[PDB]
């Protein structure tokens, strides 16, 4: 049981806390005397249950939980996939190819190029850029239930930071094991955010909608809107940067309406430590806190879009 309270700050009532200062009992190395230690959890990681206000971990009622070892890192490194003896891997070398059909210029390789396993949603990060004009790929364009993978030609500079100098408290749940809690925050209580240059994004979106008209009519209106709803991993730009798991609001990126014919865009990013990626139940991972402000610059190289069924099909 976690007896939490608001983090030390000065109002307003719209800050809706987000960061909670939790105190609880804990088992030491010995199997006797207890331990009154405190931590600092995000709002998405805890959940109250009904004297003070009482919380609990959001996964305690779903599955077990394991802490990531601080020795390993979540840095996506290039991995070449190769074929055994007697087999071969064919590579399509045309500059325009939607992924399906016969390929004019085919070459064979033993090992593919360096593909970094970047786990992300909505925004494809650090991928291979397409050739000449941007490509639009889909298993079934007529089906509004099949996703639409987009590939970019020019990379979109994205800047993400974690404006919170966190402190790593290493409480000892011995013998052997050790939990890495979040101590007090050095500085101001700010939230993570990601910046995208309005100039780069305007050109990228206009190059995609001009390619979308090659499939939805030459003179048609294409409108962009944010996600419909559901899990947090589907409605937000989920990614990893510096060990932490960001969840950014992409309502400022998909707010436009294009007809047939100088600063940065800041996006609200939340951070969750206890995750259950890949629709996996039974294995919950606690990402250990990371000391210091985390900064990362990535390349926006593609999108994963879905189309609505409301139609009114030949109009917009």
């Amino acid at each position, epitope marked *: 049981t976690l007896q939490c309270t608001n983090v*030390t*700050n*000065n109002i*307003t009532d*719209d800050m809706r806390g987000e960061l909670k200062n939790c105190s609880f009992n804990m088992t030491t190395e010995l199997r006797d005397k207890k331990q009154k230690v405190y931590s600092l959890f995000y709002r998405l990681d805890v959940v109250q249950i009904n004297s003070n206000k009482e919380y609990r971990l959001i996964n305690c009622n779903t599955s077990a939980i394991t802490q990531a070892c601080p020795k390993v890192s979540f840095e996506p490194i290039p991995i070449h996939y190769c074929a055994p003896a007697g087999f071969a891997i064919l590579k399509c070398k045309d500059k325009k190819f939607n992924g399906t059909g016969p390929c004019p210029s085919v070459s064979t390789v033993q090992c593919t190029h360096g593909i970094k396993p970047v786990v992300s949603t909505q925004l494809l990060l650090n991928g291979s850029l397409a050739e000449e004009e941007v490509m639009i790929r889909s298993e079934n364009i007529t089906n509004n239930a099949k996703n639409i993978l987009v590939q970019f030609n020019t990379p979109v500079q994205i800047n993400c930071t974690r*404006p919170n100098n966190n402190t790593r408290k290493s409480i000892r749940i011995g013998p052997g094991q050790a939990f890495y809690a979040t101590g007090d925050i*050095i*500085g*101001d*209580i*700010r*939230q993570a*955010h990601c910046n995208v240059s309005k100039a780069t994004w305007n050109e990228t979106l206009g190059k995609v909608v001009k390619q979308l008209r090659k499939h939805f009519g030459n003179n048609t209106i294409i409108r962009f809107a944010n996600s419909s709803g559901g899990d947090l991993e589907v409605t937000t730009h989920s990614f990893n940067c510096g060990g932490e798991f960001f969840y950014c609001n992409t309502s400022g990126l998909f707010n436009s309406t294009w007809i047939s014919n100088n600063d940065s865009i*800041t996006l*609200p990013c939340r951070i969750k430590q206890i995750i259950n990626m890949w629709q996996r139940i039974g294995q919950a991972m606690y990402a250990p806190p990371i000391q210091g402000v985390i900064r990362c610059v990535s390349n926006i190289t593609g999108l994963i879009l879905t189309r609505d069924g409301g139609s009114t099909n030949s109009t917009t």
Partner: antibody
Amino acid sequence: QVHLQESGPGLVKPSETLSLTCNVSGTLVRDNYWSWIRQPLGKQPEWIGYVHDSGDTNYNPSLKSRVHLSLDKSKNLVSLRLTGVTAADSAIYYCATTKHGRRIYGVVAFKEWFTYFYMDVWGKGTSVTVSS
Amino acid sequence: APTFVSVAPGQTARITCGEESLGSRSVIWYQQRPGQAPSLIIYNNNDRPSGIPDRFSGSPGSTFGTTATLTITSVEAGDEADYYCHIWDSRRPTNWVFGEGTTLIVLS
């Protein structure tokens, strides 16, 4: 030139209501912020609260349920009221103009800032002693 | 409660007031000569208004974990007064009481 003059009773009985007045000459009471500062003998100055037009007025959490401030736009002066005075309220009350400032540390848009006040033009001050 | 700092004339005086820094500060300093009203010396950590010499300098409100310090270069007999500070921390509520002052003694 900005001249401020404080005037009060000087002696207020215990459990009474202290009333002070800051006669302002040189500026309008609507175009500035106005603050009151108290100071016991041999202690650090204690901020009483700031008053401004359009309802922007906040008080000292320590003196919330005892202080009342007002601005007279017809007589061009600042008023002060303190109900239930004791021996701890015996101090020197000042009236000073107040300029506001805004300190930005975050991304502005996320209300990652705070407003700080500072007095630049003070007055001579009035003496208030609480005794029966 | 009271503190004292004695500095020879022409040297440099430094004054500590207020609690330890917890966040971004906006320390406002004031000087009070005996028997008179408080005057503004340095507002917003190290910003001096019109009329204040460059001899009065304050610690920047960007250092986390230090107390407010007022540096006075070329100490003269005229600088002998009381100095108060108004701590503006972003994690602490508005301090309606100035920090405890420090008295400057000009030696010789």
